[PDB]
Amino acid sequence: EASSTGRNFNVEKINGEWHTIILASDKREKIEDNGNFRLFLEQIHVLENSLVLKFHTVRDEECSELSMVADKTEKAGEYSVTYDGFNTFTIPKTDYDNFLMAHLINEKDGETFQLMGLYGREPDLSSDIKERFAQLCEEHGILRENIIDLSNANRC
Numbered sequence: 001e002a003s004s005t006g007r008n009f010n011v012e013k014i015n016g017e018w019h020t021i022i023l024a025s026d027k028r029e030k031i032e033d034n035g036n037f038r039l040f041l042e043q044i045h046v047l048e049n050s051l052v053l054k055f056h057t058v059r060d061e062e063c064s065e066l067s068m069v070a071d072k073t074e075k076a077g078e079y080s081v082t083y084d085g086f087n088t089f090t091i092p093k094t095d096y097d098n099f100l101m102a103h104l105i106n107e108k109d110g111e112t113f114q115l116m117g118l119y120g121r122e123p124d125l126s127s128d129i130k131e132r133f134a135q136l137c138e139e140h141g142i143l144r145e146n147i148i149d150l151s152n153a154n155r156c
């Protein structure tokens with residue numbers, strides 16, 4: 001297990017397929033049925049100073065491809081991407097082969113909100129990992145009512 005902000009982090013290892021398992025935010029509407037941030041990650045392609053992120057959005061079961069590139073910032077293990085405002089994110093924890101936890105801060109017109117996600121190499125993860133994710137969300141001030149499990153709706 002490693003953190004993108006640590007020194008033993010090997011970016012190249014998060015390359016490949018991933019799935020959105022759980023999404024959480026202190027701004028629930030952002031990840032609800034019609035939210036701009038209810039994104040289902042499909043793949044991460046690691047570049048020297050960037051990350052190519054491929055997702056799909058869903059509207060009444062219809063899926064649409066979406067891609068974007070996040071660039072490294074001045075801070076180690078942190079990336080930024082423009083999407084409905086300015087976003088910076090880090091990877092507080094991942095084991096490379098099974099799960100990945102992300103933490104993002106969005107700033108738009110003086111307004112801010114944070115989003116945290118749990119991603120898996122498989123379309124679902126154990127309840128222990130999910131609970132461990134819920135505990136990290138708590139530490140960031142995000143309550144369970146604002147945590148949404150999408151493991152049963154992440155496929156097209």
Ligand SMILES: CCC(=O)CCC(C)(C)O
Pocket residue numbers: 037039041053081083087089102103104115117
């Ligand atoms: C605009 C980019 C996102 O919402 C999701 C970022 C990750 C996959 C890092 O959590």
